[PDB]
Amino acid sequence: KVFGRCELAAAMKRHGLDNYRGYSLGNWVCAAKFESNFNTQATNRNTDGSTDYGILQINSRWWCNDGRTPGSRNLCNIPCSALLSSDITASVNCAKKIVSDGNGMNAWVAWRNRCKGTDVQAWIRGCRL
Ligand SMILES: [Cl-]
Ligand SMILES: [Cl-]
Ligand code: NA
Ligand code: NA
């Protein structure tokens, strides 16, 4: 599923991401835009052989099991394919674990390089929330 901007904001808010660990909703919508273009089916292979999955591009070396990343942890205890569903629950629950591990949203490279320090509130402007 490819989400609309306000549609995704509403879904993330219902799942408890607004101000989760101090990150306002616009941060999460901005990260999703540049990680996946709002597409739940997005996948990208990394140089080390791991793969990133879903709307928030969660990596198989640490967070999910895809059966082809040797020596990986499955810290969210989920198959990586569950992160591609039109239902974002599994991606949101795993993202909550990631953002709480010490480095905040800096775990997402696209957030650091394209959202951090910008007017992220613009990503939810005009939405009925
Ligand atoms: Cl915001
Ligand atoms: Cl980047
Ligand atoms: Na929308
Ligand atoms: Na893994």
Curated annotation (Swiss-Prot):
- Check the record and name the CDD domains matching this protein: LYZ_C
Q: How does it assemble?
A: Monomer.
Note one Pfam family from the annotation.
Answer: Lys
Subcellular location(s) per record: Secreted
Protein known as: Lysozyme C
Residues reported to bind substrate: D101
**What Enzyme Commission number(s) appear in the record?**
3.2.1.17
GO cellular component entries: cytoplasm; endoplasmic reticulum; extracellular space
Cited function: Lysozymes have primarily a bacteriolytic function; those in tissues and body fluids are associated with the monocyte-macrophage system and enhance the activity of immunoagents. Has bacteriolytic activity against M.luteus.
Top-rank taxon: Eukaryota
